[PDB]
């Protein structure tokens, strides 16, 4: 399976990339909203891990949902009700906060792919 | 023309109703998100003035846009960039803050109907 990690912090992007590669996923990366959209169209990932804050995540997920039902897992340091709810309502299938557990992230990615 | 005013404060709802009636609009009212949706479907207004905070406005406008291009003018006490931008991106044609000028509200309603 192919995962697109949309994350503007190269340290976090590398941790997720390393862990998904170890699990046997193919990884493509993007570091802003424009790159996320280009990678999305060109690579057709099976799942996207999308941070909410990008050079926004809300906007990327909105435009994606115009054409695609690809599962989106939103990742963010923002952990209030309002953040989670508006990520889910704007199309996220799931919303995990940072810092996260590597094993939980993996379990939640598999649960998204299982249902999809 | 028919205006649906979705506002959960009966004092503000009455000020807008009074002013739109004086301008020759037919007015229907709704005081929460559920009533807004019911009035929308049953009354088919030409325009909707939608407050953002309801017993949300963001959710109402989202679901409306699933089926309809009816012009939406968002009205709110929240006046930050983030509020305006996410109201517009979630489908509002316009975003006016409270307190507002009665004459400006009227001018902006007419400008929405002119283009539509
Ligand atoms: Xe958005
Ligand atoms: Xe929403």
């Amino acid at each position: 399976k192919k995962i697109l990690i949309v994350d503007d912090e190269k340290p976090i992007s590398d941790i997720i990339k390393f862990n998904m590669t170890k699990e046997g996923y193919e990884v493509v990366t993007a570091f802003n909203g424009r790159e996320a959209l280009e990678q999305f169209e060109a690579e057709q990932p099976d799942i996207i891990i999308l941070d909410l804050m990008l050079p926004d995540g809300l906007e990327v997920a909105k435009t994606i949902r115009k054409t695609s039902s690809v599962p989106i897992l939103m990742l963010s340091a923002k952990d209030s009700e309002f953040d989670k709810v508006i990520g889910l309502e704007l199309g996220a299938d799931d919303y995990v906060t940072k810092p996260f557990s590597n094993r939980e992230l993996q379990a939640r990615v598999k649960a998204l792919l299982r249902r999809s």
Side-chain angles (χ1 to χ4, degrees), chain A residues 67-83:
Chain A
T67 58
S68 185
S69 56
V70 68
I72 292 169
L73 184 165
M74 209 152 281
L75 243 196
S76 173
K78 310 198 139 291
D79 60 349
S80 66
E81 153 184 311
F82 172 86
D83 305 301

Side-chain angles (χ1 to χ4, degrees), chain A residues 1 3 19-20 23 25 46-49 71-73 93-94 96 102-116:
Chain A
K1 289 273 183 165
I3 311 173
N19 287 123
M20 297 304 139
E23 287 280 302
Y25 293 105
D46 304 292
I47 177 153
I48 311 185
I49 295 171
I72 292 169
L73 184 165
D93 288 278
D94 201 349
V96 180
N102 295 154
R103 262 189 199 73
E104 190 187 352
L105 211 187
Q106 295 173 183
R108 280 183 182 287
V109 167
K110 175 184 189 179
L112 281 197
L113 296 159
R114 208 163 55 201
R115 189 164 308 278
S116 174

